[PDB]
Design a protein around this ligand. Structure first.
Ligand SMILES: Cc1nc2ccccc2c(-c2ccc3c4c(ccnc24)CCO3)c1[C@H](OC(C)(C)C)C(=O)O
Ligand SMILES: Cc1nc2ccccc2c(-c2ccc3c4c(ccnc24)CCO3)c1[C@H](OC(C)(C)C)C(=O)O
Lengths: 131, 131
């Protein structure tokens, strides 16, 4: 289904990377956050839901979604309940080219979503067709 | 053209809101940043370019784009050189429902992009057709 996303955090350099994957396309969005908290997860979900038609979200750590703040973001936005290793591979390849990890992360996201169709091309096609 | 974006900052509550508008669709992405700096603008452009096919960017304040950091983000991502009032209207309507301005901003972005086709529907259609 085109509405399914998966969200997980990854750790690197003592920081936290929140990674969202559109399951049908492989498209990724990511953000570096200071620590794993429900508030950061909730805020990310609000941003994601404003950009794409997010219907359901999965995760590999179910406890990620237990906080009152996450539940409120899900409620308001109407959300119901590998590539990560690929992303860390790309991050590692570009890491020395940037001062800050967050820059390297966005470089890796850019590379992933435009590498070849591309993931960025597939998501827009999938969503447009579903409309 | 489907590759044209406009970026501007707006001020509210002593904070800075960076607003990107996809010109052909009216779709918006926004972020609350602590202050107007080239580093924040450059980082935002890197994130935007990884998500959409950003070919050119416009602004109502040309000096926004003079810093070395912005130029480097543009160079790497291959970027060449009203609704904002609407967004402030929506922000004002939902502001008292959230503690933090940043939450109200993302609520307003969500409302704008899904209000009716919707801006979110138009951008994916425009980009998919262009492929
Ligand atoms: C601080 C807080 N604290 C909270 C404590 C308990 C429950 C929710 C929050 C919420 C909250 C979360 C998600 C929402 C909210 C909405 C209105 C009001 N609050 C929230 C509509 C959209 O989604 C929040 C919000 O802050 C974060 C989004 C960064 C967590 C807020 O600014 O009010
Ligand atoms: C701190 C800095 N300082 C700078 C000083 C001068 C010029 C660029 C920066 C850059 C820079 C900007 C854009 C890029 C960069 C890339 C590699 C290295 N640096 C950058 C590829 C993608 O786009 C940066 C980067 O930091 C921000 C992105 C937050 C500004 C960085 O982490 O290296």
């Amino acid at each position: 289904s085109p509405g399914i996303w998966q969200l997980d955090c990854t750790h690197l350099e003592g920081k936290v990377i929140l990674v969202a994957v559109h399951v049908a396309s492989g498209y990724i969005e990511a953000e570096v956050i200071p620590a794993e908290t429900g508030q950061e997860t909730a805020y990310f979900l609000l941003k994601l839901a404003g950009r794409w038609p997010v219907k359901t979200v999965h995760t590999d750590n179910g406890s990620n979604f237990t906080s009152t703040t996450v539940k409120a973001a899900c409620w308001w936005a109407g959300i119901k309940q590998s590539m990560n290793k690929e992303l860390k591979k790309i991050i590692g390849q570009v890491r020395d080219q940037a001062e800050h990890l967050k820059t390297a992360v966005q470089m890796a996201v850019f590379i992933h979503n435009h590498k070849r169709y591309s993931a960025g091309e597939r998501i827009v096609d999938i969503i447009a067709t579903d409309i």
